[PDB]
Every structure is written in C-alpha cells, then in structure tokens.
JSON list of C-alpha atoms in Angstrom, two decimals:
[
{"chain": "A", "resi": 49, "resn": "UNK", "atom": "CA", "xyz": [121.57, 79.39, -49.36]},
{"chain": "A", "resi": 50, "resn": "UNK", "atom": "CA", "xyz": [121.60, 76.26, -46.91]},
{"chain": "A", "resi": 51, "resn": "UNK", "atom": "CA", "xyz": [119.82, 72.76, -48.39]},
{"chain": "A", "resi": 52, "resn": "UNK", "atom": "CA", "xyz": [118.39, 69.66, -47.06]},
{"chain": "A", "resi": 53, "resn": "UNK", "atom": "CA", "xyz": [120.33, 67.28, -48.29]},
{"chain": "A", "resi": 54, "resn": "UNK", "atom": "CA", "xyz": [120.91, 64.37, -45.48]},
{"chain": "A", "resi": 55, "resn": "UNK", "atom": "CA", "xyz": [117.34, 62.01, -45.37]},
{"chain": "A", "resi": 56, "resn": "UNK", "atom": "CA", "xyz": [109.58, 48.53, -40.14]},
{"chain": "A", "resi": 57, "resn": "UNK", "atom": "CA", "xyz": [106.56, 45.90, -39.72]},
{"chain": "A", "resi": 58, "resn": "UNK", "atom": "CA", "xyz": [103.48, 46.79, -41.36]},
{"chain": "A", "resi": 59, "resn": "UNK", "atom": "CA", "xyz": [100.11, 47.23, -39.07]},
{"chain": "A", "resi": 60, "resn": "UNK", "atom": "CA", "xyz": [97.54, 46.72, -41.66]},
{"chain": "A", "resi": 61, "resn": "UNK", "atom": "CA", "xyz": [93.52, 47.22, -41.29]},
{"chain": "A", "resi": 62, "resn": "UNK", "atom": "CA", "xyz": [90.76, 45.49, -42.62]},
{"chain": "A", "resi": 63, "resn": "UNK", "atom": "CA", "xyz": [86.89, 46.09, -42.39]},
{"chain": "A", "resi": 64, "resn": "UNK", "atom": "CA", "xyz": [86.81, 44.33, -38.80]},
{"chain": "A", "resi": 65, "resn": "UNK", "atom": "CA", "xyz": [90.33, 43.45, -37.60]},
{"chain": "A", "resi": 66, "resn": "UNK", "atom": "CA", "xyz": [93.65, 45.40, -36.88]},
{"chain": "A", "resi": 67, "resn": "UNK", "atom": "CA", "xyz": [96.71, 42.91, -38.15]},
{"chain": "A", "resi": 68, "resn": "UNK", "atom": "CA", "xyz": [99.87, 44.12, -36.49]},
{"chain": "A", "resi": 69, "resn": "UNK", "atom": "CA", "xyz": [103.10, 43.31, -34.90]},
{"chain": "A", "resi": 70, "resn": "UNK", "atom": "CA", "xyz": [103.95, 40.40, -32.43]},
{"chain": "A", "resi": 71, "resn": "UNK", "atom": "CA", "xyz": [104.95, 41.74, -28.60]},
{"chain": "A", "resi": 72, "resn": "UNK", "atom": "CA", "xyz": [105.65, 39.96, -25.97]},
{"chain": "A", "resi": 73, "resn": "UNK", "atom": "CA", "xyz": [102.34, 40.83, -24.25]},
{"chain": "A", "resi": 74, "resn": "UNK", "atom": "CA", "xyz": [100.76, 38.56, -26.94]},
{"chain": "A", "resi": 75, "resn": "UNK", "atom": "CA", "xyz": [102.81, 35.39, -25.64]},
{"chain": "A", "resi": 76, "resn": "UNK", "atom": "CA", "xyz": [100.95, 34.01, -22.79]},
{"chain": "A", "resi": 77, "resn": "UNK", "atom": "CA", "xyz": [97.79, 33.76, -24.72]},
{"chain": "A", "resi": 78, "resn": "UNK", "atom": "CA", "xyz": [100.05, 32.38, -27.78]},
{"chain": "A", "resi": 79, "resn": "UNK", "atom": "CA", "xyz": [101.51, 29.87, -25.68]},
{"chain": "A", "resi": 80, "resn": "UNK", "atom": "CA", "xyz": [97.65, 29.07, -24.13]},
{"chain": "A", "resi": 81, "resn": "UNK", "atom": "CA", "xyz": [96.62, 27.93, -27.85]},
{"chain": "A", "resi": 82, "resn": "UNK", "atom": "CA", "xyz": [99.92, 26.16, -28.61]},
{"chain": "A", "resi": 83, "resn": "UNK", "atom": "CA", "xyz": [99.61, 23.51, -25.54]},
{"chain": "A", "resi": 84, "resn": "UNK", "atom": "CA", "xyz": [96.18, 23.08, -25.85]},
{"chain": "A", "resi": 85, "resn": "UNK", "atom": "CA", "xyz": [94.35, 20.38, -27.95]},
{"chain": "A", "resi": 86, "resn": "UNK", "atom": "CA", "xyz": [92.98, 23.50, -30.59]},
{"chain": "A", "resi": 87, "resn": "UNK", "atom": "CA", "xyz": [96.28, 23.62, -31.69]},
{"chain": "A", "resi": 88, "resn": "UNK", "atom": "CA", "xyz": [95.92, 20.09, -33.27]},
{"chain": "A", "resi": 89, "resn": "UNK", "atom": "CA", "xyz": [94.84, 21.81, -36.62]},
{"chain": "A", "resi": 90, "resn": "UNK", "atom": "CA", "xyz": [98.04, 24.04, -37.02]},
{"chain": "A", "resi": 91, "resn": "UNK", "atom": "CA", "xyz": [100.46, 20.71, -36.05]},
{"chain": "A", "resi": 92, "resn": "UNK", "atom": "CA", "xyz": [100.35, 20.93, -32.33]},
{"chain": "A", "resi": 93, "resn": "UNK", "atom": "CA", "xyz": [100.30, 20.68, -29.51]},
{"chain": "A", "resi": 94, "resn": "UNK", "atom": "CA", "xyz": [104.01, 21.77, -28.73]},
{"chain": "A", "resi": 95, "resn": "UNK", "atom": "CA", "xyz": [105.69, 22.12, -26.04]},
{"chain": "A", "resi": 96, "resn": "UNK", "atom": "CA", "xyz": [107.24, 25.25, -24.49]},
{"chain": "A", "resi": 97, "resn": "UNK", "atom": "CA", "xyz": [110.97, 25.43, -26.70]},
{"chain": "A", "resi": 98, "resn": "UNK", "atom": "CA", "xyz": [108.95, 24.76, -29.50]},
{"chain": "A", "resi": 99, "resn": "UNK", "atom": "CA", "xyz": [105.85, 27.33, -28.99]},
{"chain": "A", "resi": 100, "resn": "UNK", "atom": "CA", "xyz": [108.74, 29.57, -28.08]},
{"chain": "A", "resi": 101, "resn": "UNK", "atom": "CA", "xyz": [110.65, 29.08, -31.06]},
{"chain": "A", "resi": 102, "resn": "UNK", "atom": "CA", "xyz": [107.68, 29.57, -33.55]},
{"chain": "A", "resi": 103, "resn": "UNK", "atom": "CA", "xyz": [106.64, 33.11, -32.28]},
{"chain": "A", "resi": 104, "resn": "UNK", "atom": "CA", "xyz": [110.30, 33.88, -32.78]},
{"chain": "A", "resi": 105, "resn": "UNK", "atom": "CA", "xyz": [110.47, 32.70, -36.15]},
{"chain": "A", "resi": 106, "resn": "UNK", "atom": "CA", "xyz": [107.26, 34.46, -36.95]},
{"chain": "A", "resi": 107, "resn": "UNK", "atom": "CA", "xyz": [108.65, 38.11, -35.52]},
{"chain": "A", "resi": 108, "resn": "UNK", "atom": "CA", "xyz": [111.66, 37.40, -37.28]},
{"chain": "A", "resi": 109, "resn": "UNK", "atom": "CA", "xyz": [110.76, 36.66, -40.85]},
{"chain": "A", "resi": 110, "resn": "UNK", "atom": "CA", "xyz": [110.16, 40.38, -41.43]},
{"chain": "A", "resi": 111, "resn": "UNK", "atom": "CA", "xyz": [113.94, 41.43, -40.66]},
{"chain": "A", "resi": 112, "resn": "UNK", "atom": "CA", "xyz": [114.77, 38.03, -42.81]},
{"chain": "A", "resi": 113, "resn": "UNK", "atom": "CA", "xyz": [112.82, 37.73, -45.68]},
{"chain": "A", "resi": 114, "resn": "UNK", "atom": "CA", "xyz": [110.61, 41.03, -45.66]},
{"chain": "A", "resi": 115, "resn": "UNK", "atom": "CA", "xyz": [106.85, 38.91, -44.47]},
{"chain": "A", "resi": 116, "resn": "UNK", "atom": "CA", "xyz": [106.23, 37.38, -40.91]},
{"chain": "A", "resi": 117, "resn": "UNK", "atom": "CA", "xyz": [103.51, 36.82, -38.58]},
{"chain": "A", "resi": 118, "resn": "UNK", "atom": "CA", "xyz": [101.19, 40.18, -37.26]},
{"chain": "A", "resi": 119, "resn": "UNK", "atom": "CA", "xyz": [98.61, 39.42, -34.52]},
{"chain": "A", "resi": 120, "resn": "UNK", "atom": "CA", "xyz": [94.82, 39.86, -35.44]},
{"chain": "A", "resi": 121, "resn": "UNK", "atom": "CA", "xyz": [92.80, 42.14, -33.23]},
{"chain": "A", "resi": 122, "resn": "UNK", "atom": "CA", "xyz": [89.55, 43.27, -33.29]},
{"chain": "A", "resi": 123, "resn": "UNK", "atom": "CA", "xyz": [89.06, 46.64, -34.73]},
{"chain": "A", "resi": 124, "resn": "UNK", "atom": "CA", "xyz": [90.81, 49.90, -32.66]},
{"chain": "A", "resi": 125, "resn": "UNK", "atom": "CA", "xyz": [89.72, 47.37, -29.40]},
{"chain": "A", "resi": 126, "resn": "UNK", "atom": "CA", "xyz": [93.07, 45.73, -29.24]},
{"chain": "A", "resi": 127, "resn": "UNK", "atom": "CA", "xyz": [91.58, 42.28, -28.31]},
{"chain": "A", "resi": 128, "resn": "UNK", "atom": "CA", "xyz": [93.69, 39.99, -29.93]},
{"chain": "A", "resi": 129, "resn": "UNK", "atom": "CA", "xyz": [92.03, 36.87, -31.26]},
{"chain": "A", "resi": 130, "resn": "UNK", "atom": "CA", "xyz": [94.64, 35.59, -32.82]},
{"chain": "A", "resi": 131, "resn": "UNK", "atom": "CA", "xyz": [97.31, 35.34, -36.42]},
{"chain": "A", "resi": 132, "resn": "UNK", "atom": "CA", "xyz": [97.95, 35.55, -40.05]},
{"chain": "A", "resi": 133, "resn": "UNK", "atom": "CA", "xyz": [101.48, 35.63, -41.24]},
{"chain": "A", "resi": 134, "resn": "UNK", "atom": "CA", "xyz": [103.75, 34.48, -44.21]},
{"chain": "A", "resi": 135, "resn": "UNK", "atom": "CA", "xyz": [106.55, 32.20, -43.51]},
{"chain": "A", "resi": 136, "resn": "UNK", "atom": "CA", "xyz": [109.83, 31.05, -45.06]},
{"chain": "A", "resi": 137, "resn": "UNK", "atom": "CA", "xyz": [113.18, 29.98, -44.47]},
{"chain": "A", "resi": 138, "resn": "UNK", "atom": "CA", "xyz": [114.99, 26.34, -43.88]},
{"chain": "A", "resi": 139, "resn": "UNK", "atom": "CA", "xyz": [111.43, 24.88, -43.03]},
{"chain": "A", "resi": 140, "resn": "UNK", "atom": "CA", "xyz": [109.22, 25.93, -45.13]},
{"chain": "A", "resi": 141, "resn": "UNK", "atom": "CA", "xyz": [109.96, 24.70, -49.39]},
{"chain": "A", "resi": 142, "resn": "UNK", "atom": "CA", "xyz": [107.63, 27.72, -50.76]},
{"chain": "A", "resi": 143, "resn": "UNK", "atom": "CA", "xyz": [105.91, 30.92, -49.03]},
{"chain": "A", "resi": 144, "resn": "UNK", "atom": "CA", "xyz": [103.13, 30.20, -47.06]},
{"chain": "A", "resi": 145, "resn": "UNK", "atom": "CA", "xyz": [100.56, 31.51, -45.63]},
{"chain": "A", "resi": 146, "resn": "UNK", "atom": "CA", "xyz": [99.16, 30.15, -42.33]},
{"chain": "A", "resi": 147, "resn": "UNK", "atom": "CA", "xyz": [96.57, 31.67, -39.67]},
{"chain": "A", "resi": 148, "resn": "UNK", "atom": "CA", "xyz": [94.97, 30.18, -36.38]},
{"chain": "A", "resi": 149, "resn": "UNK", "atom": "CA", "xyz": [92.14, 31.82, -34.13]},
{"chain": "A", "resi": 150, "resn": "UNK", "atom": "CA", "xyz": [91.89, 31.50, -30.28]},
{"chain": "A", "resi": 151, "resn": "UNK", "atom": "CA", "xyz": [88.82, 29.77, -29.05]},
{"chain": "A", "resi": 152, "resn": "UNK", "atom": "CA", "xyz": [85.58, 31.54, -29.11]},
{"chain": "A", "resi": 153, "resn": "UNK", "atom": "CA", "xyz": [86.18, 33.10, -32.16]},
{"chain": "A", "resi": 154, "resn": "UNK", "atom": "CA", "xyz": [85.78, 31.30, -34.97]},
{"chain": "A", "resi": 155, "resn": "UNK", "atom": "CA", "xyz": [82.98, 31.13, -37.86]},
{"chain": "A", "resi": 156, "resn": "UNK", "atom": "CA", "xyz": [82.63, 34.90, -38.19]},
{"chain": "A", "resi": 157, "resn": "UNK", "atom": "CA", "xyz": [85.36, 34.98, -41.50]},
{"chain": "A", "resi": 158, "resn": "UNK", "atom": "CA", "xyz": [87.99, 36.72, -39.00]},
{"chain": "A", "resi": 159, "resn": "UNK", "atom": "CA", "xyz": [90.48, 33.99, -40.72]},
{"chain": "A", "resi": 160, "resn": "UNK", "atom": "CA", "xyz": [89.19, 34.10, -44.68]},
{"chain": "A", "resi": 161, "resn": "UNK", "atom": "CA", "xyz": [89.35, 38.10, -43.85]},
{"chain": "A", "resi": 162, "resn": "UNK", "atom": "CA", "xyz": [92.85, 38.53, -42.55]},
{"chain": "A", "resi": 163, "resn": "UNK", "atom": "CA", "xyz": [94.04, 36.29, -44.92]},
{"chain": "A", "resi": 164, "resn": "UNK", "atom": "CA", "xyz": [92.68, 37.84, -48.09]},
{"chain": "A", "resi": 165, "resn": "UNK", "atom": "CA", "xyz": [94.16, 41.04, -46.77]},
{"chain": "A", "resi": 166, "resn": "UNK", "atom": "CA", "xyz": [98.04, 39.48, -45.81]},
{"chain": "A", "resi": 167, "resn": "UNK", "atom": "CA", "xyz": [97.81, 37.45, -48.88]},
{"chain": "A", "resi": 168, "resn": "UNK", "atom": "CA", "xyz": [96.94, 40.19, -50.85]},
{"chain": "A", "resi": 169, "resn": "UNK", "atom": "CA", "xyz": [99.57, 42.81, -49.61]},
{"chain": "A", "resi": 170, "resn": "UNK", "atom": "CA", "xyz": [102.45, 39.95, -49.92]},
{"chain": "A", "resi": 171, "resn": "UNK", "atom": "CA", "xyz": [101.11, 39.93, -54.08]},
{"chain": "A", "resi": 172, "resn": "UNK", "atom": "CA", "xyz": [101.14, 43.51, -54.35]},
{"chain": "A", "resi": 173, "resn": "UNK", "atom": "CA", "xyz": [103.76, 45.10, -51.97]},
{"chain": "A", "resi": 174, "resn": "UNK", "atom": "CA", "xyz": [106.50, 42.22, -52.30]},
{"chain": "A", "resi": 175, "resn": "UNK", "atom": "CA", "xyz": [105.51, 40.93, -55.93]},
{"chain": "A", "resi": 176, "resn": "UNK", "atom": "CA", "xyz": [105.44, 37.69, -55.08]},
{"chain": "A", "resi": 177, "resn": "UNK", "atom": "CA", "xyz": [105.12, 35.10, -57.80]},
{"chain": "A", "resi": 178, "resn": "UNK", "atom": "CA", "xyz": [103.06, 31.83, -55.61]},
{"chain": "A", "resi": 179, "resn": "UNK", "atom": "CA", "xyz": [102.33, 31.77, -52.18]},
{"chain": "A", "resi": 180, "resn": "UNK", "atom": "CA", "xyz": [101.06, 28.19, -50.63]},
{"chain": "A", "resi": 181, "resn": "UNK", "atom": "CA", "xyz": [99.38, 26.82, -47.83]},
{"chain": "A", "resi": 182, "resn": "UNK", "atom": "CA", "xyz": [100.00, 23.45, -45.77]},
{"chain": "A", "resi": 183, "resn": "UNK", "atom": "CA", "xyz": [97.02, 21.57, -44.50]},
{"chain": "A", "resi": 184, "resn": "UNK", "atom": "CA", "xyz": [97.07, 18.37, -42.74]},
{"chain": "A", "resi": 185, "resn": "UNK", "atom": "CA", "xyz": [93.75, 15.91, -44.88]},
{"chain": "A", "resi": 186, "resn": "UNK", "atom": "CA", "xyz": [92.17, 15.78, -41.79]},
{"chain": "A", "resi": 187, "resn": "UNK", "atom": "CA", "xyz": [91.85, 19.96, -41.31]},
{"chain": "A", "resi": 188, "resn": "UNK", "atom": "CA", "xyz": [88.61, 20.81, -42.50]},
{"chain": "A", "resi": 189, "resn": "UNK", "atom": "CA", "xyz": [88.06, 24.11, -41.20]},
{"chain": "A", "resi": 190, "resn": "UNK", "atom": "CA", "xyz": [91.77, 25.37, -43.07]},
{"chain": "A", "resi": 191, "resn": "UNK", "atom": "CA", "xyz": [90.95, 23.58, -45.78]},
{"chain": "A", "resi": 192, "resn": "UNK", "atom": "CA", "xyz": [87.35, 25.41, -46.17]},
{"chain": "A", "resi": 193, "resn": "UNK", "atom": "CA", "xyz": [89.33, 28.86, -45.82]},
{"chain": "A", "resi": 194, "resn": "UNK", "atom": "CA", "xyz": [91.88, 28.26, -48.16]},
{"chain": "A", "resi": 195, "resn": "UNK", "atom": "CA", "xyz": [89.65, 27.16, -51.16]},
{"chain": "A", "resi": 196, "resn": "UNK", "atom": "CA", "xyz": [87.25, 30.58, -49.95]},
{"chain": "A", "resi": 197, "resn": "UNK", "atom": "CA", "xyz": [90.12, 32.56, -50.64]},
{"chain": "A", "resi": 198, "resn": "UNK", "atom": "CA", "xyz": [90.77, 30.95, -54.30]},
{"chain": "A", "resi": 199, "resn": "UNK", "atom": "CA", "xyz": [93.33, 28.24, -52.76]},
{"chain": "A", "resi": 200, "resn": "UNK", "atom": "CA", "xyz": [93.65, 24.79, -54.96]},
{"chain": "A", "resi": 201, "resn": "UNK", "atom": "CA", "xyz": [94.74, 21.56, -54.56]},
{"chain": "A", "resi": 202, "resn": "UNK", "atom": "CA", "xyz": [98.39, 21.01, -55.93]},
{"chain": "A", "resi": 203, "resn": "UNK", "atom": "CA", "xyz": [99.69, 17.46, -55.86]},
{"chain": "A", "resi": 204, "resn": "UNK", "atom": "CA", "xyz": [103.13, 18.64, -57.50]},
{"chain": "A", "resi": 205, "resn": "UNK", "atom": "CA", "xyz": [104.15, 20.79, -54.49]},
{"chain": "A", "resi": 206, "resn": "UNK", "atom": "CA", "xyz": [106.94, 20.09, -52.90]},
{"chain": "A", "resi": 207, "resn": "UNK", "atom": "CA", "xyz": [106.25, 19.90, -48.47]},
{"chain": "A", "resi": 208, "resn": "UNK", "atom": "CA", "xyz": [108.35, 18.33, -45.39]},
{"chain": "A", "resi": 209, "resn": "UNK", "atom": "CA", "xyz": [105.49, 16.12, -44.36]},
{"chain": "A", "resi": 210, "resn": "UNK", "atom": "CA", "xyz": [104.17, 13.57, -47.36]},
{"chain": "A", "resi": 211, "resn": "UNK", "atom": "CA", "xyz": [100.63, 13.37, -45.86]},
{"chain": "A", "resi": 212, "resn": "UNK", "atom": "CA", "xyz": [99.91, 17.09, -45.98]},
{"chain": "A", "resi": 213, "resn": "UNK", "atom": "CA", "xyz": [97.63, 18.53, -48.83]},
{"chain": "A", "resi": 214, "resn": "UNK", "atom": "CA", "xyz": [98.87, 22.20, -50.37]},
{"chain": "A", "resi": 215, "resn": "UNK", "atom": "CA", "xyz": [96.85, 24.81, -51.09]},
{"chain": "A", "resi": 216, "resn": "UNK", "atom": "CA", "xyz": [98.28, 27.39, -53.87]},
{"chain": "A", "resi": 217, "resn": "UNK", "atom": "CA", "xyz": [97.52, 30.87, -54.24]},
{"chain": "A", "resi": 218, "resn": "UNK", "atom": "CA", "xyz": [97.78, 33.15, -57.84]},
{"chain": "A", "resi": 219, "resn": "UNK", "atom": "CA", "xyz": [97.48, 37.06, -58.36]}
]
C-alpha cells in the first residue's frame, strides 16, 4: 500500500583517451604548459593569475553554461596528456572549441580524436546550432586539426582579436 514517490560533468571515452573532469591534481602540470613557450599556440605564455583564472573558467563553464573543459588521459592509465573543452561567456562571441597537448605527445591524433568526440557530444547532447574555433594565422598545427575535423574558414565571424582566423563547425 506504500509508493515511491520522492526521486554532473560528463567523463566521456573514446577509442584511446579518457576525457574527464578538471581536479586540482591536474594544475601543476596545467600551469607547466601555460608558462612555457608551447603555450605560444593557445595565446600564451601567461602568467600565474592568468593560468589560474583559465582552469577556473574552464571547470566552471559546466555549472554556467552546461560545456567546459575535461582533461584528456590516456585510456583507464590516468596519464593525463592534456585538454579539450567548450567555452563561452563574456570572452568568448560564439562556442568554441579549443584543445592543447603537453609535450611529448603530439602527432598521434590524441587532439583531432578528443575533439571529434567533445564536438560531437556538444551537437548531440546540448543541440547546439555552430560551434567555432579561434586560431592565431601563424598556428599551423590547430589549424591542420580543425580543417581534419570538417572546420572552415569563416571571414564573417565575429572574434576579440582582428588577426585571428575562425574555424566553424556544422552537424
């Protein structure tokens, strides 16, 4: 005669990696790549306020705007070599999708493959209508995985910095 009646951040997996939530374990080696010249490629380097404030923005998207930042590691190893995430708010004019490696890992797809797989959950599970990416002209190697993943060239985007190409995603 009784009834039942009274009733988070996505970890997603891929062939190779493990995409998951940012903890602060994951910070010192963050903050490594931030400082350093590799950096150059995703705007950098920063400085310590400013690496600090970026991992906070990219935890914190997924309370605000339902996408953020998860931390690539290598299958069920938990080496983490490095991040994918979708970013919005005050700073950003459209959705965008950004990734970096940490050094010693790079031309083995781990980037093209965790962003298919982020891009591709943001089109399915949130619906989104566009998604972009913002490349500085002189970024080959982002430029290279953006048009991989069917990324192209749109001169009508709006962006905060006028030298910066952006990439657009469909479907």
């Amino acid at each position: 005669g009784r009834e039942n009646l009274y009733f988070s951040i996505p970890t997603l997996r891929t062939e190779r990696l493990t995409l998951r939530p940012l903890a602060m374990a994951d910070f010192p080696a963050y903050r490594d790549f931030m400082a350093s010249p590799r950096s150059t490629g995703v705007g950098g380097p920063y400085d310590l306020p400013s690496t600090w404030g970026v991992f906070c923005h990219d935890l914190a998207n997924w309370h605000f705007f339902g996408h953020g930042a998860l931390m690539i590691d290598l299958g069920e190893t938990g080496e983490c070599i490095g991040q994918i995430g979708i970013n919005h708010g005050p700073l950003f004019p459209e959705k965008e999708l950004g990734w970096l490696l940490y050094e010693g890992h790079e031309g083995r797809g781990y980037a093209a493959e965790a962003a298919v797989a982020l891009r591709d959950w943001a089109f399915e599970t949130l619906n989104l209508p566009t998604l972009v990416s913002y490349v500085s002209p002189q970024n080959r190697k982002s430029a290279a995985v953006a048009e991989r993943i069917g990324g192209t060239l749109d001169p009508l985007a709006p962006r905060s910095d006028p030298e910066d190409l952006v990439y657009r995603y469909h479907q």
